[PDB]
Structures are given as structure tokens and as C-alpha cells.
Amino acid sequence: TISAQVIDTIVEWIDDNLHQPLRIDDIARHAGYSKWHLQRLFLQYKGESLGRYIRERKLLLAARDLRDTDQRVYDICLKYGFDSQQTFTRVFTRTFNQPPGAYRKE
Template sequence: MEYKESVVTDLANFIVLNIHKVKVRDVAIRSGFSYRTIQKMFIFYLNQNISDYISGMKIQMAANDIIYSPDSIESVAIRYGYSSVQSFTHVFTKKYKISPRVFRDINHRVYVQSL
């Protein structure tokens, strides 16, 4: 793995570990590269810019919480920084093609049956 790729991998891990509070600016500062350079590196290695990567990880981790935690959809939305359940539902439905509630119902049944 080349140096720049390892930097992007490390930053991706940093994003996941700090998903509840991380901002693009934090990632750029942590990288030691200019904002423009680190954006280009993310696009080259991950095929998306930093902001899209953060947003994607937030919704993916929120989906995981919807399945495996008893927390309300509202609590999950707030945990991942959405300003309202409506905005969270909009983003979630755009990605998964179903609402968070339906997603929970379908996946929770599958999870419980597998126990």
C-alpha cells in the first residue's frame, strides 16, 4: 500500500471512530495535507469526496443502529447529527428505498429469526 493510500485509509478509520462529531475540516487538518489535496486523494482512492464519505458512513452506521439497537428512530437520527427525523428519513429513504421504520421491521425480524 502506498503512502497516500494509507493516509486515506487512516483518515477513513478516524471518520468512523469520530462519526458523531467529525467535520470535513477535522479530516483535512488531521491529514497534514491541504484541503484540496486531501479531497483529491479521497476521490482517487474512495471514489467520493470527504463530505460524501462522512454522510455515507453516517447513514450506514445509523442503519446498523436501527437494526441492532432498541433506540427510537428519532434518537438514531439525532445521534448521527440530523436536524430532524424528517431530514433523516429523507436521506435514509433515498439510499435504502424504504423508510427507517420499514427497514427496522424487516431487518429486525430477520435478525431475531437468526438467533
């Protein structure tokens, strides 16, 4: 029990939320937690910044949609959180060091 069961709610919010980005103001409101409700969790249970963890989660979620043989490549990053194509391209290039088409063909 950390801050009255915030771990059991963060995962549910991440799984049920839409492609809306997750920031301090967005998440803290109806999350049941303060900025400090989440800082201690991100420091202890995860030990990683939010901008990197959210990007990794989006990449792991899109790894299946890229294999689902979808022709609308521009909408894949949009349906999962990336509001722009260039941001998703840079994130994928810095993470996997591979072009988007090279991983989409696989």
C-alpha cells in the same frame, strides 16, 4: 504512500470520531492534510463526493442500530451524525426508497 500516509489516518479518524459532521475546515486541521491532501484521495481512491460517502457510511452504521431493537428512533440519527430527523429521513428515502419504520421493523 500518498501525501505521507493520509489513508491510514482518515479511516482511524472516521472510526474514532463522534457524531460531529465532517467538512473541509473540520477535517483538514488535525488530519495532517490540506484541502488538496484530501481532494486527490477522494478523486483517486474513492471517486465520490464527501456528502454522499459520509451519508452512506452513516446509513451502513445505523443499519445495525435499527436492528438492535431500539425504541428511541429520534436519537438513532443523532448519535451517528444527522443533526436533524428530516435530513436523515430524506437521505434514507433517496437511498433505499423505503420508510424508516419499514426498515426498522425488519
